Structure 1
Amino acid sequence: GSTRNGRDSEAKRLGVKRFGGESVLAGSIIVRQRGTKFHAGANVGCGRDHTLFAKADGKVKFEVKGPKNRKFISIEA
């Protein structure tokens, strides 16, 4: 007859906006994410929704770093 499902939320367009080696202007969003899947490295800020954004003009650099092998995003300015 009827079903109790049939709901879903709008897709949030998360994920990587600027990949490795891409030249960005300061302020450019590099990744939108839920929590810190990626962490802010050098010249990268972490917004209130865990958005990583460039704090300097330069090139995006993904790196695995530290004792937990966490993924950091940096900007090579």
Structure 2
Amino acid sequence: GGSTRNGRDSEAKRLGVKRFGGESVLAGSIIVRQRGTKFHAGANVGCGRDHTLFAKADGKVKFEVKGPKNRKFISIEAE
């Protein structure tokens, strides 16, 4: 009684992936609510205010994993 209601779309999620064109500065991965589900890394960093991970220079996207117990890390391999 008195239920209903819901937030909108909001999207969130990988948008670039794997080897991707990854032009200049694509917002490859927008799952905010993050700095966590994914992490800044190689020639990509930025990690904007809404935790968006995005290309910092042109190349292919990567997806690795490292030493602070797991943790994901997206990065861009210069092509």
TM-score by length of 2: 0.51
Alpha-carbon displacement from aligned partner over 1:51-76 (angstroms, at most 9, x marks no partner): 00000000000001122210000000
1:27 to partner: Cα distance: 8.8
Q: Tell me, which stretches of 5 or more residues in structure 2 are unaligned? A: none
Q: Which runs of 4+ in 1 moved over 4 A?
A: 1-36
Alpha-carbon contact 2:25-2:58 (below 8 Å) kept: yes
- CA shift in 2, pair 1:22/1:29, >3 Å: farther
Q: Tell me, which stretches of 5 or more residues in structure 1 are unaligned? A: none
Alpha-carbon contact 1:54-1:75 (below 8 Å) kept: yes
1:24 to partner: Cα distance: 6.9
Structure (1/2) with the larger strand percentage: 1
1:37 to partner: Cα distance: 3.6
1:30 to partner: Cα distance: 9.2
Greater alpha carbon shift after TM alignment, 24-33 vs 42-51: 24-33
State the alpha-carbon separation in 1 of the partners of residues 33 and 7 from structure 2.
27
RMSD: 5.6
Greater alpha carbon shift after TM alignment, 20-29 vs 65-74: 20-29
Aligned-residue identity in percent = 100
